[PDB]
Design a protein around this ligand. Structure first.
Ligand SMILES: O=[N+]([O-])c1ccc2nn[nH]c2c1
Length: 300
């Protein structure tokens, strides 16, 4: 049975998965997504390198394919990441002038969000903005613009598509005692008090074995920032233990503002961490014990 259908019956929005044209045309990915998942994110086709490889010149073929496939198959769409240090073209990284970088960043956000206006449920606007000690990461945006880049990004995104839910996301938010987890909460509270339109915090849960248990404390901490939504993103677990996966799912169920869960992929061989067999389907596209454990946990 379908973990998306089951999680919806427990009052959540979706169980989703990252994908793209290459996946959808191979393996059993499209069939599994159609049956078992309710939302898709572009794994890479919306990243900056992919969408704006030279200044002002956009590439939308790959993202368009994903968006169209999702619409044809009745799936919600999440997308990102609009502003982060990964997948960043060299032409962006070499900018030194504050006003230029603001305009570059605003044009990137507005162009992408306008193209898909009204079709995207969730946009991950800012990603990986924090250092492990909780200070802000000194990426090109912070170095050139300063800390205003985060409010500017969210303000620009809200104007481009007021219907989308706007998220900040990060990894290593999995322990409630870790400084990064505390810092994103405190800063999101401050930004929201200044009227910055941060609708969500997304937790990029690339987990090692045994880390599911701590998410039961970390996810309510993230929700305490007061955003209308929190999400679990990029989920995979080294070893794919049912205990870890069920602990992650129950953290979602326990946190009223947690709208859903997105796994990093469908089948183990297609993970960037394949040797850790960290996904819910094996290399034959058969569901693994963790998939069945999630089914049993969600059944009523
Ligand atoms: O949850 N995800 O797997 C996922 C993948 C790529 C993304 N880019 N922005 N947000 C993302 C979430």
């Amino acid at each position: 049975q379908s973990i998306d259908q089951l999680i919806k019956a427990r009052g959540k929005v979706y169980f989703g998965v990252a994908t793209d044209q290459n996946r959808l045309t191979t393996g059993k990915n499209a069939a599994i997504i159609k049956a078992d998942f309710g939302m898709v994110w572009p794994e890479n086709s919306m990243m900056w390198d992919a969408t704006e490889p030279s200044q002002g010149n956009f590439n939308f073929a790959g993202a368009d394919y994903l968006v169209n496939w999702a619409q044809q198959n009745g799936k919600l769409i999440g997308a990102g990441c609009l502003v982060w240090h990964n997948f960043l073209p060299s032409w962006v990284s070499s900018i030194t002038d504050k006003n230029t970088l603001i305009n570059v960043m605003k044009n990137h956000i507005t162009t992408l969000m306008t193209r898909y206006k009204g079709k995207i449920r969730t946009w991950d606007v800012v990603g990986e903005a924090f250092n492990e000690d909780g200070s802000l990461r000194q990426n090109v945006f912070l170095n050139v613009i300063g800390e205003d880049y985060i409010p500017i990004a969210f303000q620009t995104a809200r104007a481009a598509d007021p219907n989308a839910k706007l998220y900040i996301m990060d990894y290593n938010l999995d322990s409630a005692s870790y400084p990064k987890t505390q810092a994103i909460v405190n800063r999101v509270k401050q930004w929201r008090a200044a009227g910055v339109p941060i609708d969500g915090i997304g937790s990029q849960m690339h987990l090692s074995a045994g880390q599911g248990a701590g998410v039961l404390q970390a996810l309510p901490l993230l929700a305490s920032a007061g955003t209308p939504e929190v999400s679990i993103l990029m989920l995979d677990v080294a070893g794919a233990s049912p205990t870890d996966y069920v602990n992650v799912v129950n953290a979602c169920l326990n946190v009223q503002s947690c709208v859903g869960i997105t796994v990093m992929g469908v089948a183990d061989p297609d993970s960037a961490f394949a040797s850790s067999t960290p996904l819910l389907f094996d290399g034959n596209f058969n569901p693994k014990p963790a998939y069945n454990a999630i089914v049993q946990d969600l059944q009523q």
